[PDB]
Amino acid sequence: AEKCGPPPPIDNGDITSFLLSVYAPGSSVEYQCQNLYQLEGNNQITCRNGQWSEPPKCLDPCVISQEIMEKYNIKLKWTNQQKLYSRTGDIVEFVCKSGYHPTKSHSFRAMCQNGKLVYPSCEE
Amino acid sequence: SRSTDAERLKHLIVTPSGAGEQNMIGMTPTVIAVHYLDETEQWEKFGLEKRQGALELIKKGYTQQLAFRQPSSAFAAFVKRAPSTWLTAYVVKVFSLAVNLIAIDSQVLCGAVKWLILEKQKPDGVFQEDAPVIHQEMIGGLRNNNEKDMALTAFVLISLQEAKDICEEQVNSLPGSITKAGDFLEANYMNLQRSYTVAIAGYALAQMGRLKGPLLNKFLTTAKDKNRWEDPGKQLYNVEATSYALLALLQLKDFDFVPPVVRWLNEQRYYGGGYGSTQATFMVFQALAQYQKDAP
């Protein structure tokens, strides 16, 4: 019969309803992540005997900047834009900058996972 | 002191009507005129009985605008249209200023803020427009799409910071979003070339205490003759940019740089109103009211 306080916070996410300070037992709220972040786990949590169920996670996207590419002497293969947004699990293809050749490197076709992307590298 | 006489602003009390964009066009001058006349305490000589009337008009606008608040708490010209980032941010801006004049529902304001945060902010802090407004003349210097990321991010961030007092306790993701937008603006400020973007992003950064060092020097040395921020183009854009920059200087408390800027603004003798006058009318008089409020 115990009532719950405000639902828990999650990084890069928020509840979809007007926030309250007292929730009745059995009440539920739903979460939403920021643009390009992925919702992992049940997006709904429920109040039960003063405790909220575990809230979902906001899996990070990848911002592919021109700076890191210039550091590794790389560029986007297909499109010619200098900044890319990639959801987690998305696949990004690279090529060497003009006048550069691949070193010993991870694949130039690389997957973004939870804000982590292993970049390839070129030299010469 | 150097207050603009209320008579010259008579035409700014406007009955709002139309759809989601036109209604805001009608609401803007009345809200900002009541704001400026309250700050300058001109209602006694101008007519106290009129003020209540204006308030009704404002309320009218507010009520009508709620007919275009989509279930997502976002706004567009019509409920069948995709919601506009700019229009939602501008509704937040106007309503945050109007909270002192009429009753503004925090549910609506903070829902719009939360929609902006959760839907239209990019992973690097940029705010993006996916359905531009039809009335391209109501967005002022934003109509020039050059440096659109910085300019729109500054606009939306100013809206977020003006609603921070009402929505802080309701929107847990608001300070982090403000910080991300400020990080983007601060990282790309020095590469700016438009005086308009310099001014608006400088106001956004000064609200955060981030306009400092070389960024502050670039903001100050971008002004022409140390009294205006101008670019080749429509003069209304220059008026609006100089208003943003005057608000930035007021936030910086650089009262030694202000007098010539306010002098130039008063010499412009711009009394707002008319087609394509939304941003200029709102901003020049918000800035002048803030000047009358502060300033030694």
Curated annotation (Swiss-Prot), chain A:
<comment type="subunit">
    <text>Head-to-tail homodimer and heterodimer with CFHR1 or CFHR5.</text>
</comment>
<feature type="domain" description="Sushi 3">
    <location>
        <begin position="2"/>
        <end position="60"/>
    </location>
</feature>
<feature type="domain" description="Sushi 4">
    <location>
        <begin position="61"/>
        <end position="123"/>
    </location>
</feature>
<feature type="disulfide bond">
    <location>
        <begin position="96"/>
        <end position="122"/>
    </location>
</feature>
<comment type="function">
    <text>Involved in complement regulation. The dimerized forms have avidity for tissue-bound complement fragments and efficiently compete with the physiological complement inhibitor CFH. Can associate with lipoproteins and may play a role in lipid metabolism.</text>
</comment>
<protein>
    <recommendedName>
        <fullName>Complement factor H-related protein 2</fullName>
    </recommendedName>
</protein>
<feature type="disulfide bond">
    <location>
        <begin position="4"/>
        <end position="47"/>
    </location>
</feature>
<feature type="disulfide bond">
    <location>
        <begin position="62"/>
        <end position="112"/>
    </location>
</feature>
<feature type="disulfide bond">
    <location>
        <begin position="33"/>
        <end position="58"/>
    </location>
</feature>
Curated annotation (Swiss-Prot), chain B:
<feature type="disulfide bond">
    <location>
        <begin position="110"/>
        <end position="167"/>
    </location>
</feature>
<comment type="subunit">
    <text>Interacts with CFH. Interacts with CR2.</text>
</comment>
<protein>
    <recommendedName>
        <fullName>Complement C3d fragment</fullName>
    </recommendedName>
</protein>
<feature type="cross-link" description="Isoglutamyl cysteine thioester (Cys-Gln)">
    <location>
        <begin position="19"/>
        <end position="22"/>
    </location>
</feature>
